[PDB]
Structures are given as C-alpha cells and as structure tokens.
Amino acid sequence: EVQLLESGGGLVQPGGSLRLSCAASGFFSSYAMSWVRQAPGKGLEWVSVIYSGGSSTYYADSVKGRFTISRDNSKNTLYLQMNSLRAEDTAVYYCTTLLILESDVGVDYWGQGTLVTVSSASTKGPSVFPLAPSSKSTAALGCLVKDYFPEPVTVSWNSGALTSGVHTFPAVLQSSGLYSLSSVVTVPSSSLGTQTYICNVNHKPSNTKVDKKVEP
C-alpha cells in the first residue's frame, strides 16, 4: 500500500522560509516526484519536479530561483525548501508521483496535502460556542468556531462516530482578520435527548483542542 504523508506546513512571514517534508511508504527512489499547489479556491499549479536519476530538477517560472526541490533517499523523504515566501504562495502543497506507467497500467499516488499560509498575522486559538437546537421558532445543531488564525481547524462529532448529515462549512475570513466557521449536523426531530452530541474542534497551529457538549 502506497501512502504519501506531507508535513512542514504552517504560517510564515512574507520573505520568510518554510521547509516541506513529504514522506512515502511502499513503492520511492525509482520515480520522479512533483509538487502541486492550489491557492484556496483557485486551481492547481505545478511547482517543481525532481527525477529519480539523482538531480535533474525543473521549476515553474513563478517559483524559479526561490524554491529548491530535493530528496533524501536515505530517509525516503521528499523535501521542498521554500525561500523568500510571498503572500501569493498561500496554498495547499501536494507531493505526487504524477503518472507512473508500469507494465500496461497507469497509476497515480497523491498526498493528503499540507497548507502553507504566508502572512504577518499571529497565531490565535479559536473560541467554540454551542449552537443548540430548539423548536417553535427535522432539527439541527452545531458548533461555532470563531476567531482563529491561521487555517485550518478540524471539527468532528462524537469523536468521529457521527458522520451522517454533518455539514462543516468552509471557513470565512471575518472583518477582524480572523477566520470563522460552523459545523452543523441535522438529526431527525424526534430524537431529542436520544443521543449526545459533542463537537471536537482541533486547531493544531495554536495547540488548542476543545470538546464542546451541545444540548438544548
């Protein structure tokens, strides 16, 4: 089983540097790896490529001279040194094999992606407020994750057990420069007090984790 796990993402100042670490397992040194990034809401943009045969590296014009792709075959890791970072570099960075044509079948393996955000703002942990259900004014309830930076936060329900009918919305940049989103879940109206609903908010950049019980 081939698995690509990207790491190194987080917040960095304009002109600062980040070092992305892409790890792999199963079937790595034999294929050319690539980096593909995507600004939030925009399309995919190819960044750089390294070839299996040592170092035969190519870069896009937008990142040429500033980023450096490399690989450590002794640790089975793909690296991307990002120097002189600017605000337009804010994107989720994927490491990918692109096309691997072996035998007569074509395969493709992508990583989960790691978010790089370029800004001078400081890290802030989120406040979690309950959205409790009621009536006389199907039933819905959720959690409001307000005033955090930077992206992302991960929100699950009942430690990931409840998944049907859950809607976590894209974060919205408030006027204060802080993000905000809500995660709601719709349940059949007759199950009031039939189950217990807790939301698990995790904001790794601030090392904050909140478990908020939601009840009417």
Partner: protein, 219 residues
C-alpha cells in the same frame, strides 16, 4: 511555457447525459514517439486530485470505461458517456511533454439535480459568547438545489446590510445538494437593543420566501 486552455469552466450536466470538456495547448504535445503527453485529472470535493486519462487516450487503473480521452497534437477532449452523482469535482488537463508542466484552468462539473427546497434553521447567540461583547446569530439552509439563494437578515422587520457573511459547501457527491450558512454578527450592546431576530430565505423551490425567527430572552 506551454499554455493549457480549458473550455468550459463550468458544465451543468443532468445525470445519465454525456459531458464533454476540451483542452487546447499553444504547442503540439506529440513527442518524437507516438505518445501525446497530456493527462486528465479529477479533483473531488475535499480530496486530492485523482488521475483519469493518461497520455491523451489511455484509461488509468480503476477508471470506469465511461471515461474516455481523445485527440492529438494541440486539441484533446475528455468525454463522460453517462455522468453520475459521484462525478462532482473539477477536471484539469496537464501536459508532461516539456518543462515546466502546466495545468489547465479547471472545469467545475455541476450535477443538474431535481429541485429541492432548503431546510431553514435559525440559531440564537449563546450566553457564553454574549459575555465576550459579541453576538453571532446563524441561519442554516440544508440540502437544496440549485445553489442560487437569497438570505436576508431582518431585525424588527429592519433589513440588515453589511454585518452578515455566507459560506456554501461543494455539491454533495450523493444527492447533488448544497448547504449554506449565513452568520449575522453584532455587538452585545446592539444585540440587546432589539428583540426580534429573523433570517428570510428566498429560493425557487419555495413558493414564497420563508422566514425563521426568534425573540431574545427565550432559552
């Protein structure tokens, strides 16, 4: 650099009907051999890109025969014989002939469903947030189609403007619906100055606009 141009950018297709996306390059993608270095990629909502067609017309492993690619040189076309609900996402064409590799603009495939009126919900601010000097009242529209909707905030029948923001999810891969949340944020002083808080929803699946409301001071 080779410029990859996709057309169209958005493609509404009813399930069971064909879909066709074109990809034009500013230079021939044919090498000295007989392979066209053009790939097609699909990115489903919330997932990483997934390879569909490689080298112009070769179907990748796991891709159903409903997907097919054709073309040579500077004009290629991706075809879906019968689109399904799970085909929601953005389709990109990438060239791998000469460096730098370049992707297209992307084609967002919208699945044309039957009309479904939204379920509107209203959420009052919590007492915990009211202690912080701010109040957030949230309005929820659950599983509707099409995406077009008007959400207006009225406080004591006074239409609000400038203090609300909307957030819409991608089309669901199962029922091809959208969900939308609109948050109205006021300070604790302004929130306590009024009594009736309501969000009014206008949608084509609703004969007349629907309003969910509440009066502050109730649990």
């Amino acid at each position: 650099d080779i410029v990859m141009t996709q057309s169209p950018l958005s493609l509404p297709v009813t399930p069971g009907e064909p879909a066709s996306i074109s990809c034009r390059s500013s230079q021939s993608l044919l090498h000295s051999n007989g392979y066209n270095y053009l790939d097609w990629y699909l990115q489903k909502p919330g997932q990483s890109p997934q390879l569909l067609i490689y080298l112009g017309s070769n179907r990748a492993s796991g891709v159903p025969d409903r997907f097919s690619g054709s073309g040579s040189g500077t004009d290629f076309t991706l075809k879906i014989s019968r689109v399904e609900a799970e085909d929601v996402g953005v389709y990109y064409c990438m060239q791998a002939l000469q460096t730098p590799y370049t992707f297209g603009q992307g084609t967002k495939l919208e699945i044309k469903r039957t009309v479904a009126a939204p379920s509107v919900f209203i959420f009052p601010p919590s007492d915990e947030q009211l202690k912080s000097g701010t109040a957030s009242v949230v309005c929820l529209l659950n599983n509707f189609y099409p995406r077009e909707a008007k959400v207006q905030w009225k406080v004591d029948n006074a239409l609000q403007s400038g203090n609300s923001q909307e957030s819409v999810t991608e089309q669901d891969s199962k029922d091809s619906t959208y969900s939308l949340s609109s948050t109205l944020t006021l300070s604790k002083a302004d929130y306590e100055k009024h009594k009736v808080y309501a969000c009014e929803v206008t949608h084509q699946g609703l004969s007349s606009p629907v309003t969910k409301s509440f009066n502050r001071g109730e649990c």
